[PDB]
Every structure is written in C-alpha cells, then in structure tokens.
C-alpha cells in the first residue's frame, strides 16, 4: 500500500541477527585511517629481534 | 592447503578452566567468520559458538552461554575458546569451523571447512 | 530451535542408488547443508544451499528440496560412501540431524 507509514517501528527488534553474513566485504575501504593513534604502543616487545642483520 | 589445527585438549576436572586454540593456514583468516562445533562420544554434532570476522559479534548457544567465550587473533591466524566451570556433559570433540558463506550472501552459510578435532574429557 | 528429523538407517548393496531424507520443524529457505562423516574423523561438506555441491565433491552426490522437505540422493553407491551423513540447517540457528548410517546390505 502506497499509503502506509514509512517510519520506523519504534518496539522493532534491535538485537543483531546471529545469521547475518559473518565474513567480510571485499569492496570495504583498503586503505589507511589517518586519524588512527601514531603513537607506539607501551607494552609492544622492547627486546630485540634475533633474525636482525648482525654485519655491521 | 586449507587448514584449521585444534590443539589445548586434554583431562579437565569438573569445575575448572581450559583454553583451546585453532591454527589456520591456506586461506586468509581475517575475512572469515568462525564456529566452534562440539561432537559428545556416541552422540551427534552440536553448534556451540560464532565469532565475526574481525570479533565484533560473539553468539553461543544455549548450553555454553555465560560459560564459554569465543575470541581470535587475526596477526596470528588463530581462534581460541575458553571454556569455564566446566561439566561432565562438556566431553566431547571440539571441531574449529569455517563459515562457507559467499560474500555477499548476507545470510551466512554452512561449514566449509573442518578441523581435525581435539578431545576434551571431563571427569574425576 | 529448528529441530531437524531425518531417517534412521538404511542398507544399501554397493552399485545400487540411496535415497536420503530430511524434514524441518519450520521452514528454511534452501538454507540447509549436507555433511558426511566416517568413524574417527571430521564431518565433511558436501552439499550447501540444498542442492550446490561442494568443492571436490563427486558428480553422485545431489541434493533436492526447499523449505520443509530435503532429500539426499546418491548415485551409484560406492565403497567411499558408507558412512554417516548428517543434515544441518543454517536459517535460525546452526542446529543438525541425528544423522542416517547407510551400511552395507
């Protein structure tokens, strides 16, 4: 009916549906967020890499 | 070359704490949605948790909701379970699954690939 | 819960053709899968969306119905195919079968 109400039911169901497409969208935005943190992370591993080049 | 590894299994008295991880290899892990699926020794196979392809949405079943948790590590390929106050209804094989959903079929699909399992046994 | 019945047992002489069944509480539109698991190791796919069969899967195995009514169909029953197969759906919730054995008449 051309008539009906368009708006939104207020009482519709606004829990997630569990068999919703749980992978993801190959067409979703592959690039960089510029307003990510740039500062480094406190706990990251402070201990040096074995598999660094040792010559000098 | 498609590949998920169990491993964490083992003997776990009732009432205690055990962790099981699942490996992933041949394919890429973080645009994949994943499930755990439970097999109990002599009975059928029953779902028991999804996770999201990047972890935003956790689901459970009835069974092993407030008692199980569903996580993933997408740097390292792998899936974990931690499984709490554990009971004796728990024993079983723990397959890791794969959801083989089209990506763009917006309802989520069967289980594409399994597992080899890992055997959890609960008992005194 | 979608709880999903299917046939017992069912005995089939290699060659010969095996009809499997499967029925739903409710309805699922062609949102049910087909898997096939031998004593000691992981179910394996082998039919999705009721009747697409899955990757390397043999030309025998097909796959039928919608909505409440499911059937399996395997074609020229080889030695490979004995085994559990189990039905699952993927509509409401991820909820299987209690699976059919085909043993060897």
């Known amino acids: 009916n051309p008539n009906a109400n368009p708006n939104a039911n207020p009482n519709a169901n606004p829990n997630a549906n569990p068999n919703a497409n749980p992978n993801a969208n190959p067409n979703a935005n592959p690039n960089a967020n510029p307003n990510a943190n740039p500062n480094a992370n406190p706990n990251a591993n402070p201990n040096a890499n074995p598999n660094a080049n040792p010559n000098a | 070359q498609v590949q998920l590894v169990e491993s964490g299994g083992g003997v776990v008295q009732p009432g205690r704490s055990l962790r099981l991880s699942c490996a992933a290899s041949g394919f890429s892990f973080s645009t994949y949605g994943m499930h755990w699926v439970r097999q109990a020794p002599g009975k059928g196979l029953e779902w028991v948790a999804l996770i999201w392809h990047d972890g935003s949405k956790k689901f459970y079943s009835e069974s092993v909701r407030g008692r199980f948790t569903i996580s993933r590590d997408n740097s390292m390929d792998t899936l974990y379970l931690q499984m709490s106050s554990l009971r004796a209804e728990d024993t079983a094989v723990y397959y890791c699954?794969?959801?083989?959903?089209?990506?763009?079929?917006?309802?989520?699909?069967?289980?594409?690939?399994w597992g080899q399992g890992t055997m959890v046994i609960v008992s005194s | 819960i979608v709880m999903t019945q299917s046939p017992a047992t069912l005995s089939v002489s290699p060659g010969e053709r095996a009809t499997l069944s499967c029925r739903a509480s409710?309805?699922?539109?062609?949102?049910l899968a087909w898997y096939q698991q031998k004593p000691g190791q992981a179910p394996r796919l082998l039919i999705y969306?009721?009747?697409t069969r899955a990757t390397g899967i043999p030309a025998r195995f097909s796959g039928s119905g919608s909505g409440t009514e499911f059937t399996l169909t395997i074609s020229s029953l080889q030695s490979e195919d004995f085994a559990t197969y189990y039905c699952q759906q993927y509509k409401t919730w991820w909820t299987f079968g209690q699976g059919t054995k085909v043993e060897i008449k």
């Open positions: 699954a794969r959801d083989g959903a089209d990506y763009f079929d917006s309802t989520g699909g069967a289980f594409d690939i």
């Open positions: 969306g009721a009747s």
């Open positions: 409710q309805s699922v539109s062609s949102n």
